[PDB]
Structure formats: C-alpha cells, structure tokens
C-alpha cells in the first residue's frame with residue numbers, strides 16, 4: 108500500500124523536522140509529486156513549498172508548487188503552477204501549465220531548477236519552462252531560515268491544498284526531462300544516490316513531519332492493493348458545437364461506415380389515448396402506419412402501445428405546452444398562455460380548474476418512460492407550434508418528464524402524419540436542417556454551416572445549409588443555398604414533399620438509440636463498442652489491444668427495474684440528485700426551481716448565467732425588490748434517492764458573483780438516522796465541478812449547501828458510493844469476447860472477463876494481418892461486434908514510442924492520451940515540439 112496525505116483545507120499544514128533533513132537544496136533542486144487535486148481549490152493553492160522561516164511577514168521568497176488561477180479570470184481556468192522567487196529577482200516568476208487540471212486524476216507534477224533553466228512538467232510532459240530566475244536561491248548564511256511545507260503556504264492567508272498527495276521526492280539537481288516519463292523506472296540509481304535529498308514516506312507522519320502552527324495532521328490514507336493504471340485513452344469528448352459522444356467526428360464516422368452499427372432496431376413508444384370514454388383509434392392506427400413506413404427503410408420499426416387514461420378530470424382540462432398555471436399575472440403578454448381559458452374556473456390554485464400544463468400532466472401520469480417513448484397530446488394555443496420533443500442530452504430523456512407532445516388535430520389525420528416524424532427525429536438527436544443559418548446567434552457562431560460539415564449546423568454533412576423556409580424549392584439568396592434539403596423530414600416544409608432522412612441523420616438516429624434509448628428497443632443485446640480496439644503495446648510474440656466500453660456506458664447486465672445502469676465496473680454507485688428544496692420563497696414561475704438542480708448537469712455553457720440551474724435570487728419581474736439572502740443564508744437541500752456510504756460528492760456550481768471565497772458559506776452533509784456534518788466554507792470555480800471526499804461514519808442521503816451569494820447556481824450534484832456497494836451486489840458485470848481474423852485456438856472467441864479493457868494475444872506471428880473485433884456480451888445475449896482493427900504484427904502504430912514518417916506520426920509520445928504534448932493521433936499540438944524517439948513534448 109502507498110500512504111497518502113489527504114489535505115481537506117481544514118487547517119492541515121505540515122513542516123519538515125530539522126533533524127530529518129540536514130540542509131535544503133539552495134542552488135539546484137527537483138521536486139516531484141503525485142498530486143490528486145479536487146475541484147474548487149483556493150486560487151493560489153500550494154501542494155508543497157520551501158518558504159522563509161525567520162521572516163514573519165509575507166514570504167513569497169523561495170518556491171511554491173501547486174495550483175494557480177489567472178488573475179484576469181479568477182473564478183475559472185485553474186492550472187498547475189510553480190512560482191520561484193530568488194533573492195535576486197524582485198518579482199516571483201511563475202510557470203503556469205497549459206491545461207486546467209483534471210480533478211480526481213492522479214497527476215505527476217514535477218518542477219526542476221538548476222541555475223537558470225526552471226521547468227515545470229505535468230505527467231512527464233514539460234508544460235512550461237523559463238530562464239527568468241538565475242543564481243542560487245539564497246545565501247547559505249540564512250539557509251537555516253528556509254523550511255519545507257506540504258499542502259500550505261507560509262502566509263497567514265492559508266493557501267490550503269484540497270486533495271491527495273501520494274508521494275514527494277526531492278533532488279538537489281534538475282533531473283533530465285526523460286526521468287519524469289520514467290519516474291517509476293529510475294528506481295534509486297546509484298549515480299544519483301547522493302542527489303536524492305528527500306523521499307517522503309507519509310506512513311508515519313509524526314516521525315518525519317510536524318504540524319505547522321497547531322494545525323491538525325492531514326488525513327492519512329492507505330491504498331488497499333495496487334490501484335488501476337491511469338487510463339491510456341482520453342474520453343471522446345463532444346465537439347464544440349456538439350452535445351454528446353455521438354456528436355464526435357470519430358464515432359459518427361464509425362457509425363456512418365460500419366453498417367452493423369446501424370442494425371435493425373425496434374423502438375417502443377406509448378400513446379396516451381385522448382377520447383371520450385379527440386384522438387380516436389383511427390388516428391392512432393394511421394399515425395403508427397405512417398411512422399413505420401417513414402422509419403422502416405432505416406432499419407427502425409416501431410411497436411404500438413396505447414395507454415388509455417380513464418381520468419375524466421384530466422380528460423376535460425385543456426393541456427397547454429409551456430403554459431404553467433403560475434405564469435398568469437406577470438405584467439407581460441405570454442404567447443403560450445393566450446388561451447380563452449387562461450384570460451369557467453380560471454383560478455390556478457383550484458383543484459377543478461379547466462386548464463393545465465403539459466408538465467403537470469406528465470407529473471400526474473408518471474408513465475413508464477424507462478422502456479417506452481411516451482406520446483402526449485397537448486393542444487397548444489399557437490397554430491404553427493404543432494408540438495415538442497425532448498432532446499437525448501436533456502436530463503429527462505428517459506424519465507417520466509420525457510417524450511413527445513403532439514396536437515391531437517395533427518396526429519394521424521391524413522396530410523399531417525409527418526409532424527410526428529419530425530418530432531421523433533428531434534427525439535433521436537436530430538437538429539433542424541436550417542441549424543447554423545437560421546438558428547444561429549451571431550456571425551461568429553462556430554456552428555454556422557457555410558459548407559457541408561460534421562461539426563457545424565445540424566452536425567450532418569449530407570444536409571446542405573438552408574434558411575428556415577416553408578417553400579418546397581431552393582430558397583432565394585438572403586450567401587447562396589444550392590441543393591437545399593427541403594425534402595428532409597427535419598425541415599419546416601409541408602408534409603407533401605418532406606420524405607427522407609439522409610444517411611448521416613440515420614447514423615445519428617442509431618447512435619442516439621444505442622447511447623441513451625437502449626431500453627426502449629426490444630433487443631436484450633448490449634449496445635455496440637463505439638470505436639475499434641487499438642494496439643497499445645507490441646512485442647515479437649504478443650500484442651495488447653485496448654477497447655472502449657459499450658457506447659451506452661452500461662457495464663452490467665441491464666435488467667429492467669434494476670440499478671445496474673448506474674453501477675461502475677468495480678461496484679461503485681453514481682447517482683444524481685433525486686429531490687430538491689429551498690427555504691427561500693419558492694418562485695412559482697417555474698424558472699430556477701429546485702428541480703433545475705436535479706438529474707444530470709444541464710448547463711451547456713458552464714460559469715455563465717443560465718436557466719437550467721437552481722438559483723435563489725433571480726426574480727424577473729421584481730427589479731426594485733432585490734431580495735437578498737437571509738441571515739441563515741440561502742440553502743439548497745439536495746436529496747439522493749438511495750442512501751450509500753458515500754465515496755465522493757460533486758457540486759456543479761456553474762455560476763456565482765461574490766468575489767469572496769465564501770460563495771459556499773457551508774456544505775452540510777446529511778446522513779441517515781444520524782446528525783449532519785458541516786464541512787465549513789469551501790472554494791469553488793465556476794467552470795469546474797467542486798468535489799469533496801466524504802469522510803463520514805454513516806450513510807449519506809443528502810447535502811444541504813448554504814450560500815451567502817445571491818446569484819450562485821447549482822446546476823446539478825452527484826454522489827459516488829463506496830466501491831463494491833451492495834446496491835450492485837446482485838448485478839452481473841459485462842464480459843467481453845474477442846475475435847481475430849484467423850480463428851483462435853479451437854476457433855472460439857477469447858473471453859476477457861476483466862474490467863480494465865485490455866487483452867493480450869500470444870498466438871500472433873510477426874508479419875501477419877489480424878482483424879480484432881470485440882463484443883460486450885452480457886447474460887448470454889451476445890452483443891454486436893465492434894468495427895474491425897486491422898493490424899500487421901510488427902508494423903508501427905501510434906503510441907509505440909517510435910516516430911514514423913511512413914504513417915504520418917509526429918510526436919509518438921508512447922501513450923494514446925491527448926493533451927500530453929501530442930494528440931492520440933500522434934500529431935503535434937499547438938506550441939509543442941516533441942523531439943526524440945520517446946517523444947518529449949515541450950512549450
């Protein structure tokens with residue numbers, strides 16, 4: 108086990124005992140540490156640093172390694188930093204990393220300084236270097252006035268570090284860059300024995316370290332067994348204009364190319380019958396036939412399920428889309444509520460009112476939205492607003508609040524069956540063909556579709572850019588629009604000529620059916636592995652192939668009604684907020700309601716004002732009455748459905764205005780059948796999710812965030828349970844099956860039952876071609892095969908430590924992790940200059 112020092116920001120500052128170390132390096136040094144930071148640390152947080160001891164005033168002299176945030180930004184863009192200030196140069200010189208740190212990821216942060224060349228490395232890649240400082244750090248005469256601290260700063264401001272510190276190593280000379288990539292391989296070399304000044308152990312803390320100024324000892328943790336190696340493949344983050352992993356160019360291309368990834372899917376959709384004991388049976392039958400005819404050519408058929416609601420109470424009320432009962436009486440003209448019945452019982456607070464909102468109908472019905480696509484019938488006042496649909500990337504895609512709302516008069520009637528097809532396409536992740544030219548904000552909008560592209564507009568190349576036009580002809584020049592797709596189902600053109608979905612849109616329809624709506628289909632086969640396996644290691648006798656998990660992300664045998672969907676491969680249990688509340692006046696307008704802090708995060712642009720996050724202060728129609736937070740502070744009580752021994756808690760605070768560090772005045776973790784534990788004020792960044800490791804002796808069932816800030820916005824919150832939580836005890840992990848171009852021994856696929864997604868093959872002969880395919884089988888129902896990895900044994904490949912101009916590689920850093928100087932496609936990034944066969948990128 109590796110001892111670890113967790114600093115919680117709760118007054119834990121260590122100091123080096125004088126007896127342990129004879130003298131701190133003065134001329135040259137090399138400080139390296141495995142630091143696992145957590146979201147929302149102090150602005151100039153220090154993980155370690157040598158500071159003046161004799162001087163009692165502010166002591167920026169010496170050096171400090173940690174995390175710093177840009178002054179011009181302050182609230183966001185926090186990057187690893189290393190600030191050194193010798194007695195010669197008046198101003199401290201700060202090396203700042205190139206990327207904002209990743210909380211929860213073990214990062215090997217190192218920094219060397221020998222004479223003048225001071226360099227800062229992250230995970231072995233030199234992310235900064237400078238020569239501003241020169242000469243020895245300080246005169247030896249006052250060398251006794253320099254002392255080393257961990258997770259703190261000498262100043263009284265208390266620059267506390269929040270996160271884990273695994274190991275700390277201190278040399279007296281700047282080690283070569285190649286050491287850091289091979290820090291675990293340079294195991295106490297004989298030649299550098301005299302240079303190894305310090306090697307912190309941390310198992311006994313009292314033996315080597317003493318708390319600074321009565322502050323408590325930082326918590327001591329021990330790793331039970333060897334931890335999994337750091338992930339070698341970076342996640343497929345969505346593009347700038349995308350919103351999901353199915354908007355990525357690589358996965359989209361794989362779905363367009365590999366036709367098994369567009370197989371026969373049979374969706375299930377539910378229809379809430381609306382007819383006197385409005386929507387008759389003929390409407391349902393005709394609409395179902397039209398839907399099947401318009402969607403079966405794309406290997407998507409639909410099964411009809413009609414849910415008859417014999418509640419006359421809901422039968423009589425007019426259901427209005429987006430017209431909440433509380434909107435009436437706001438001194439403004441609301442287009443959604445210009446109904447005769449909204450201005451015989453028009454009182455919103457009456458149990459027998461004749462008008463209702465579709466949200467209320469959804470909440471009252473609470474239909475099974477986990478296995479069905481529910482269709483609702485709300486009569487919208489607007490004649491042009493036929494209906495609405497829920498995005499896959501919205502928090503309510505599969506919950507009872509999701510589905511399609513369609514006007515009864517436009518459902519199943521001849522000449523109007525294509526509106527439901529449009530809305531269903533909206534459900535399955537399809538934007539409007541006029542996205543980027545009609546639905547564009549400004550001329551600088553990246554999503555603007557000037558040329559057929561997979562990253563702008565509706566994220567489809569086949570769909571040419573066209574303005575929103577009702578004519579079934581190429582629009583007039585407003586930029587020209589040749590070959591406008593007025594025949595596409597996702598255009599505002601009438602039924603008579605919108606007929607087809609382009610292959611790109613069909614690939615999208617299938618990608619989002621596998622990703623989010625897997626449960627809707629009747630297939631028990633787990634979703635398909637999105638990207639083909641890639642080779643991460645090769646020898647003269649063995650080949651190692653790594654593969655991503657199923658696109659849906661479910662790594663367990665998904666049984667209907669079970670919790671296996673949210674269980675990680677090691678038994679962890681991740682769950683978002685299930686309920687919310689606020690002791691401030693619960694605004695009835697429906698905006699910034701506690702339900703906005705429920706489910707997965709929704710804020711598209713973090714750290715800017717948004718309508719998808721809870722917020723106390725924001726009142727639209729009361730400008731003079733700027734209600735401030737009470738003395739007790741505005742509170743948000745997020746309740747999680749299932750109590751579990753919490754491992755971690757994450758708050759998505761995506762906005763705030765108070766420049767003080769006390770935006771979160773307190774964070775009271777609520778246990779079950781026990782008292783609540785207060786965690787005191789915590790710092791947070793608007794762009795990063797604040798993270799807290801829960802050291803609590805009980806089952807956490809909620810969190811009560813107290814805030815003195817009026818404009819703070821909590822977009823969502825997540826609770827991660829202890830590994831091997833019981834909630835997933837009955838769940839069965841998903842195994843994997845691998846097939847090769849030649850049949851394996853006996854010809855059967857190899858069964859990889861592990862959870863780190865790696866397979867080693869020893870039956871490979873040099874010079875032969877092999878085709879690797881992977882299935883994530885579960886429960887005996889074998890899934891779909893992955894796209895084929897074609898590799899000739901011995902051939903060069905990315906992430907093999909050898910640059911090859913033959914294959915177009917530039918920086919083959921030896922790993923498939925992007926951002927570490929070179930991309931996973933073995934391509935030089937901006938500002939990086941990777942040199943040497945084991946490429947060592949640098950700014």
Ligand SMILES: *[C@@H]1O[C@H](CO)[C@@H](O[C@@H]2O[C@H](CO)[C@@H](O)[C@H](O)[C@H]2NC(C)=O)[C@H](O)[C@H]1NC(C)=O
Nearest residue numbers: 366367368369370371404405406610613614617
């Ligand atoms: C729809 O699914 C069918 C399978 O039922 C796919 O069919 C194959 O099509 C490819 C070309 O795309 C051919 O090379 C194969 O020989 C076909 N096989 C069979 C069994 O038909 C079809 O490609 C899919 N198309 C879409 C748009 O989803």
Ligand SMILES: *[C@@H]1O[C@H](CO)[C@@H](O)[C@H](O)[C@H]1NC(C)=O
Nearest residue numbers: 474475476477478479667668
């Ligand atoms: C959704 O329908 C399936 C199919 O029978 C059922 O097993 C499941 O329990 C339903 N959802 C809920 C939340 O009950």
Ligand SMILES: [Ca+2]
Nearest residue numbers: 703709719822
């Ligand atoms: Ca939200």
Ligand SMILES: [Ca+2]
Nearest residue numbers: 903904905909
């Ligand atoms: Ca290579």
Ligand SMILES: [Zn+2]
Nearest residue numbers: 529530533539
């Ligand atoms: Zn639309």
